[PDB]
Design a protein around this motif. Structure first.
Motif, PDB file in Angstrom:
ATOM      1  N   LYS A  66     106.602  87.151 132.864  1.00  0.00           N
ATOM      2  CA  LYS A  66     105.912  87.553 131.617  1.00  0.00           C
ATOM      3  C   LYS A  66     106.522  86.737 130.478  1.00  0.00           C
ATOM      4  O   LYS A  66     107.746  86.709 130.304  1.00  0.00           O
ATOM      5  CB  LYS A  66     105.957  89.085 131.321  1.00  0.00           C
ATOM      6  CG  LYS A  66     107.354  89.729 131.387  1.00  0.00           C
ATOM      7  CD  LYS A  66     107.292  91.267 131.464  1.00  0.00           C
ATOM      8  CE  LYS A  66     106.705  91.910 130.205  1.00  0.00           C
ATOM      9  NZ  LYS A  66     106.517  93.370 130.392  1.00  0.00           N
ATOM     10  N   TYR A 103      97.018  86.132 123.858  1.00  0.00           N
ATOM     11  CA  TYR A 103      98.454  86.402 123.608  1.00  0.00           C
ATOM     12  C   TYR A 103      98.590  87.505 122.551  1.00  0.00           C
ATOM     13  O   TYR A 103      98.242  87.304 121.376  1.00  0.00           O
ATOM     14  CB  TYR A 103      99.210  85.109 123.179  1.00  0.00           C
ATOM     15  CG  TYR A 103      99.466  84.143 124.347  1.00  0.00           C
ATOM     16  CD1 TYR A 103      98.507  83.206 124.737  1.00  0.00           C
ATOM     17  CD2 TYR A 103     100.659  84.194 125.081  1.00  0.00           C
ATOM     18  CE1 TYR A 103      98.725  82.356 125.805  1.00  0.00           C
ATOM     19  CE2 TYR A 103     100.877  83.348 126.154  1.00  0.00           C
ATOM     20  CZ  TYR A 103      99.909  82.432 126.511  1.00  0.00           C
ATOM     21  OH  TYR A 103     100.114  81.599 127.590  1.00  0.00           O
ATOM     22  N   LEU A 155     109.016  95.835 127.035  1.00  0.00           N
ATOM     23  CA  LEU A 155     108.844  94.530 127.705  1.00  0.00           C
ATOM     24  C   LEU A 155     109.624  94.504 129.041  1.00  0.00           C
ATOM     25  O   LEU A 155     109.232  93.820 129.979  1.00  0.00           O
ATOM     26  CB  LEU A 155     109.286  93.370 126.771  1.00  0.00           C
ATOM     27  CG  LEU A 155     108.527  93.280 125.404  1.00  0.00           C
ATOM     28  CD1 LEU A 155     109.097  92.158 124.513  1.00  0.00           C
ATOM     29  CD2 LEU A 155     107.002  93.113 125.617  1.00  0.00           C
ATOM     30  N   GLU A 182     107.813  97.914 131.326  1.00  0.00           N
ATOM     31  CA  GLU A 182     106.461  97.624 131.829  1.00  0.00           C
ATOM     32  C   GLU A 182     106.586  96.400 132.738  1.00  0.00           C
ATOM     33  O   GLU A 182     106.817  95.281 132.259  1.00  0.00           O
ATOM     34  CB  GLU A 182     105.428  97.366 130.684  1.00  0.00           C
ATOM     35  CG  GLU A 182     105.337  98.488 129.616  1.00  0.00           C
ATOM     36  CD  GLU A 182     105.186  99.907 130.198  1.00  0.00           C
ATOM     37  OE1 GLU A 182     104.085 100.253 130.681  1.00  0.00           O
ATOM     38  OE2 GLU A 182     106.165 100.689 130.161  1.00  0.00           O
ATOM     39  N   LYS A 183     106.479  96.629 134.053  1.00  0.00           N
ATOM     40  CA  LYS A 183     106.708  95.594 135.076  1.00  0.00           C
ATOM     41  C   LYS A 183     105.523  94.595 135.151  1.00  0.00           C
ATOM     42  O   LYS A 183     105.597  93.602 135.873  1.00  0.00           O
ATOM     43  CB  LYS A 183     106.957  96.277 136.453  1.00  0.00           C
ATOM     44  CG  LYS A 183     107.539  95.350 137.550  1.00  0.00           C
ATOM     45  CD  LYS A 183     107.651  96.042 138.926  1.00  0.00           C
ATOM     46  CE  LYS A 183     108.248  95.117 140.003  1.00  0.00           C
ATOM     47  NZ  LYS A 183     107.442  93.878 140.197  1.00  0.00           N
ATOM     48  N   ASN A 184     104.440  94.864 134.390  1.00  0.00           N
ATOM     49  CA  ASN A 184     103.248  93.991 134.324  1.00  0.00           C
ATOM     50  C   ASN A 184     103.591  92.585 133.791  1.00  0.00           C
ATOM     51  O   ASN A 184     104.382  92.439 132.842  1.00  0.00           O
ATOM     52  CB  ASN A 184     102.140  94.622 133.428  1.00  0.00           C
ATOM     53  CG  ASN A 184     101.497  95.882 134.019  1.00  0.00           C
ATOM     54  OD1 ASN A 184     102.136  96.660 134.728  1.00  0.00           O
ATOM     55  ND2 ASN A 184     100.219  96.078 133.740  1.00  0.00           N
ATOM     56  N   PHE A 185     102.992  91.558 134.431  1.00  0.00           N
ATOM     57  CA  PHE A 185     103.082  90.159 133.982  1.00  0.00           C
ATOM     58  C   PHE A 185     102.079  89.932 132.839  1.00  0.00           C
ATOM     59  O   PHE A 185     100.935  89.541 133.055  1.00  0.00           O
ATOM     60  CB  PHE A 185     102.913  89.141 135.174  1.00  0.00           C
ATOM     61  CG  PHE A 185     101.720  89.361 136.111  1.00  0.00           C
ATOM     62  CD1 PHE A 185     101.812  90.241 137.194  1.00  0.00           C
ATOM     63  CD2 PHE A 185     100.513  88.682 135.924  1.00  0.00           C
ATOM     64  CE1 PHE A 185     100.740  90.437 138.043  1.00  0.00           C
ATOM     65  CE2 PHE A 185      99.446  88.881 136.776  1.00  0.00           C
ATOM     66  CZ  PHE A 185      99.558  89.758 137.831  1.00  0.00           C
ATOM     67  N   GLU A 186     102.516  90.248 131.613  1.00  0.00           N
ATOM     68  CA  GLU A 186     101.644  90.281 130.420  1.00  0.00           C
ATOM     69  C   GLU A 186     101.953  89.103 129.465  1.00  0.00           C
ATOM     70  O   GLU A 186     103.112  88.685 129.320  1.00  0.00           O
ATOM     71  CB  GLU A 186     101.792  91.663 129.722  1.00  0.00           C
ATOM     72  CG  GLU A 186     103.245  92.060 129.397  1.00  0.00           C
ATOM     73  CD  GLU A 186     103.415  93.521 128.933  1.00  0.00           C
ATOM     74  OE1 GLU A 186     102.948  93.866 127.830  1.00  0.00           O
ATOM     75  OE2 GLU A 186     104.023  94.332 129.669  1.00  0.00           O
ATOM     76  N   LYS A 187     100.881  88.570 128.852  1.00  0.00           N
ATOM     77  CA  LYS A 187     100.932  87.453 127.901  1.00  0.00           C
ATOM     78  C   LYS A 187     101.246  88.010 126.507  1.00  0.00           C
ATOM     79  O   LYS A 187     100.348  88.540 125.834  1.00  0.00           O
ATOM     80  CB  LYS A 187      99.567  86.722 127.886  1.00  0.00           C
ATOM     81  CG  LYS A 187      99.104  86.216 129.263  1.00  0.00           C
ATOM     82  CD  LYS A 187      97.616  85.794 129.276  1.00  0.00           C
ATOM     83  CE  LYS A 187      97.310  84.612 128.346  1.00  0.00           C
ATOM     84  NZ  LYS A 187      95.880  84.218 128.413  1.00  0.00           N
ATOM     85  N   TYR A 226     113.032  86.256 130.930  1.00  0.00           N
ATOM     86  CA  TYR A 226     111.615  85.974 130.587  1.00  0.00           C
ATOM     87  C   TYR A 226     111.494  84.597 129.939  1.00  0.00           C
ATOM     88  O   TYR A 226     112.404  84.159 129.225  1.00  0.00           O
ATOM     89  CB  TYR A 226     111.006  87.064 129.660  1.00  0.00           C
ATOM     90  CG  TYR A 226     110.964  88.479 130.250  1.00  0.00           C
ATOM     91  CD1 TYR A 226     110.936  88.698 131.634  1.00  0.00           C
ATOM     92  CD2 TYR A 226     110.921  89.604 129.417  1.00  0.00           C
ATOM     93  CE1 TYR A 226     110.875  89.966 132.154  1.00  0.00           C
ATOM     94  CE2 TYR A 226     110.862  90.878 129.940  1.00  0.00           C
ATOM     95  CZ  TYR A 226     110.840  91.054 131.307  1.00  0.00           C
ATOM     96  OH  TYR A 226     110.772  92.321 131.830  1.00  0.00           O
ATOM     97  N   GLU A 249     101.176  81.004 133.529  1.00  0.00           N
ATOM     98  CA  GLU A 249     100.406  82.259 133.640  1.00  0.00           C
ATOM     99  C   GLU A 249      99.342  82.116 134.742  1.00  0.00           C
ATOM    100  O   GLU A 249      99.401  82.802 135.766  1.00  0.00           O
ATOM    101  CB  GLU A 249      99.808  82.594 132.238  1.00  0.00           C
ATOM    102  CG  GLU A 249      98.962  83.891 132.139  1.00  0.00           C
ATOM    103  CD  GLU A 249      97.456  83.692 132.414  1.00  0.00           C
ATOM    104  OE1 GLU A 249      96.776  83.034 131.587  1.00  0.00           O
ATOM    105  OE2 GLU A 249      96.947  84.196 133.442  1.00  0.00           O
TER     106      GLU A 249
END
Length: 134
Positions: A2, A27, A45, A48-53, A76, A128
């Motif tokens: 992320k 983004y 950040l 939240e284990k999500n791969f987020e932009k 990160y 990404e």
């Protein structure tokens, strides 16, 4: 994975212009101007284990310092844009973070700042959406 696109600007003008530059890029801007706000959302950040932009704008260089320490423990990917009028602040602050191998850019032009962000988003975009190994 992320990616946090870190931007420190001295102008509130730049904050909102960057919000539009990255609106069509997917983004999510996070504006941090208080220490509590830092300590709340930065933990998110990590939690939240999500791969987020994500894109972090912080006009407070102290909160930027704390942010990058937090990021370094999490590992990160960061692309950093520093915009400060006084280069005795800008250069010294830069080279601390640049010695850590971070992609650090200087800017004093508002329009040019936005274009350096476009570099960051396209290069982060290649991480990404999985391109070939670079």
């Amino acid at each position: 994975m992320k990616i946090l696109i870190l931007i420190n600007t001295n102008n509130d003008e730049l904050i909102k212009k960057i919000k539009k530059e990255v609106e069509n890029q997917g983004y999510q801007v996070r504006d941090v101007n208080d220490s509590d706000e830092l300590k709340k959302e930065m933990k998110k950040l990590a939690e939240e284990k999500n791969f987020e932009k994500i894109l972090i704008i912080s006009n407070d260089k102290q909160l930027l310092k704390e942010m990058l320490e937090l990021i370094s423990k999490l590992g990160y990917k960061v692309f950093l844009l520093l915009q400060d009028q006084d280069e005795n602040e800008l250069e010294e602050f830069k080279r601390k973070i640049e010695s850590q191998g971070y992609e650090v850019r200087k800017v004093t032009d508002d329009e040019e700042a936005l274009k350096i962000v476009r570099e960051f988003m396209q290069k982060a975009g290649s991480l990404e959406h999985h391109h070939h190994h670079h």
